[PDB]
Amino acid sequence: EIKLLVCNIDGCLTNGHIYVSGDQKEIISYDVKDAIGISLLKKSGIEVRLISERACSKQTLSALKLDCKTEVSVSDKLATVDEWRKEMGLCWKEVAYLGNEVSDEECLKRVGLSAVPADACSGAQKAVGYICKCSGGRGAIREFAEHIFLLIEKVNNS
Template sequence: MPLSHLHDLTDDVLARAARIRLACFDVDGTLTDGRLYLDSEGREQKTFHVQDGQGLVLLKRAGIEVAFITARGGTVAVARGRELGVQVFTGVKDKLARVRELGTGLGLPMEQVAFMGDDLPDVPSFREVGLAIAPADAHPWTAQFAHWRTRRRGGQGAAREACDLLLATQGHAPLFEGGTA
């Protein structure tokens, strides 16, 4: 798969991406645009990009484990994760501890783990994982710790760029046999 639609791919980023076996994603600001919609009853709504979902499905098909890790509670991320067949962890106060736990459970060293996030609670994970990815609109205090930054914004295809990077560096062409995002 060509990498021509991706940018700023240093040899270091390519080598890091080629090792990844577990990809963890923050939800708000990464898989969504970060805005929270609350109705008069306090029920939350979020918008997800279908291309991000397709990328996550392709990662799973390629044998890369995928997890959503969010500090917020709520059922929206759980519903999206269920739809995609992805593990979802909500209300997580210490994202790094959860990332370590997932990696250890899979027998993976941290160099084989990627984390994509956009704000300060993601920085501890960025400092330890093999590949830290930030969407284009990540907060600057967080983005400075990323190994790579997408062109697209959170909730607008940024996660798909990350998925494409992992798939391409590991030699996986898109698989077109069914499954929806």
């Protein structure tokens, strides 16, 4: 199984670039490739949720049109992800996590399937068993999704 994929926003969903104004309006972006990859995980029954340590601009979030439950301003990502885990009656082996930062490490080492984008910090890279050829905001979510579908194939054809 994988039943949940949790994705860090800044650096996995996005390339980590922020564009900000004096009135605190922020622009961030995601790639079509990755949106498609989220669409396809959802289609197949895998819930995708977005997570962040940052105080992300309030509804820049919904403007993403990704239909994912999100939680920002997170200090203990293991706690919240474990809260999501308990909510969807889930097991740690069925939780996937794409991470990139030091604050992701607790989650990465704990989950059933861990990955990082090509440009993740050294510490997040050491914590995982799958390092994407693609970088954050540039196909890593799509790349990882296709890795996940390969695991479900293995269980299906077993």
